[PDB]
Structures are given as structure tokens and as C-alpha cells.
Amino acid sequence: VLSEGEWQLVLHVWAKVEADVAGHGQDILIRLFKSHPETLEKFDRFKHLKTEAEMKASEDLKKHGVTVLTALGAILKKKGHHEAELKPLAQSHATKHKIPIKYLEFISEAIIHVLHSRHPGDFGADAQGAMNKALELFRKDIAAKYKELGY
Numbered sequence: 001v002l003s004e005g006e007w008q009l010v011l012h013v014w015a016k017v018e019a020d021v022a023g024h025g026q027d028i029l030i031r032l033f034k035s036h037p038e039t040l041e042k043f044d045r046f047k048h049l050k051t052e053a054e055m056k057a058s059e060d061l062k063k064h065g066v067t068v069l070t071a072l073g074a075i076l077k078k079k080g081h082h083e084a085e086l087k088p089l090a091q092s093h094a095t096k097h098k099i100p101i102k103y104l105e106f107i108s109e110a111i112i113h114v115l116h117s118r119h120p121g122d123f124g125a126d127a128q129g130a131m132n133k134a135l136e137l138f139r140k141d142i143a144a145k146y147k148e149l150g151y
């Protein structure tokens with residue numbers, strides 16, 4: 001359980017993200033795909049992309065980044081009371097998209113990296129630890145739903 005102070009740190013940096021949702025989504029997905037190429041293979045939409053330049057030039061990828069971060073933002077603003085938001089997400093990612101929890105660990109690492117690059121004065125150690133905890137909570141709760149479903 002995050003404390004109120006931890007959530008304040010999370011949402012303070014998140015408010016900085018929401019000034020440029022699409023730029024952040026690009027950086028995060030590209031980082032994910034480059035650091036963990038098995039993740040790219042899960043996207044029939046995107047597996048044709050073979051270079052970083054090609055990824056950066058894809059408007060479809062940029063749009064999907066907005067989808068991802070919009071969903072995450074809605075989850076983070078619920079401060080843990082996010083059951084209703086995670087049910088559909090867990091159900092699609094387990095059963096349709098076939099995404100292992102480990103790959104949620106990978107995108108969490110990419111999120112934290114990009115936040116540090118883009119917002120260092122609002123992403124000091126205190127805020128990094130709080131964001132790590134928020135993304136851990138996200139993963140914990142998705143993992144429980146996966147387990148229910150047999151994934």
C-alpha cells in the first residue's frame with residue numbers, strides 16, 4: 001500500500017507527463033522494444049518496424065502510446081482503488097494479447113527510465129521509489145487476475 005505522500009509524488013510527475021502524452025508514449029514503447037525485442041513480437045501492428053527511426057516515424061505507434069498512457073494515467077489517479085480499471089486490461093492482456101507479467105515489468109522499467117530523462121527535477125529518488133511502488137501495485141493486481149484466469 002502506497003502512502004498519501006507516495007501517491008502525491010507519483011501524481012506530481014504524472015501531471016508533467018500529461019503535458020505531452022504522445023511524446024512520452026513513443027519514448028516508452030521504443031525503449032521497451034529496443035531493450036526487450038520479444039515484446040515487439042507481440043504486436044502484429046508493429047513487428048514490421050526494424051529500426052528506431054522507423055519506430056519514431058510511425059504514427060500508428062504514436063497513437064498506441066497515447067492509448068497505453070491514457071489507460072495508465074486513469075489507473076494511477078485511482079490511487080490503488082483501481083479494480084474496475086484493471087479488470088478489462090488484465091482480461092485482454094492475459095487472454096487475447098497473451099502478455100506475460102514479466103513484460104509488464106519491462107514496460108514499468110521503460111516508464112521509469114523515460115520519466116527520469118524527461119522530468120529529473122520532479123523524479124528524484126523519492127519519486128522514483130514511489131513510482132516503482134505504484135507500478136509494482138499495478139503488476140501485483142494484474143498478476144492476481146491472471147492467476148484467476150490460469151495465466
Ligand code: HEM
Pocket residue numbers: 039040042043044045067068069071072088089092093097099103104107
Ligand atoms: C502499462 C502497461 C500497459 C497498459 C496500461 C496497456 C494498455 C493497453 C490498452 C488500453 C490497450 C487497448 C485496449 C485493450 O486491448 O485492452 C492495449 C492493447 C494491447 N496491448 Fe497493452 N498495455 C500495457 C502493456 C502492454 C505490454 C507490456 C504489451 C506487450 C509486450 C502489451 C500489448 C498489447 C497489445 C498486443 C495490444 C493490442 C494492440 C493492437 O491494437 O493490435 N500491452 N494495451
Ligand SMILES: [O-][O-]
Pocket residue numbers: 068
Ligand atoms: O501495449 O499496450
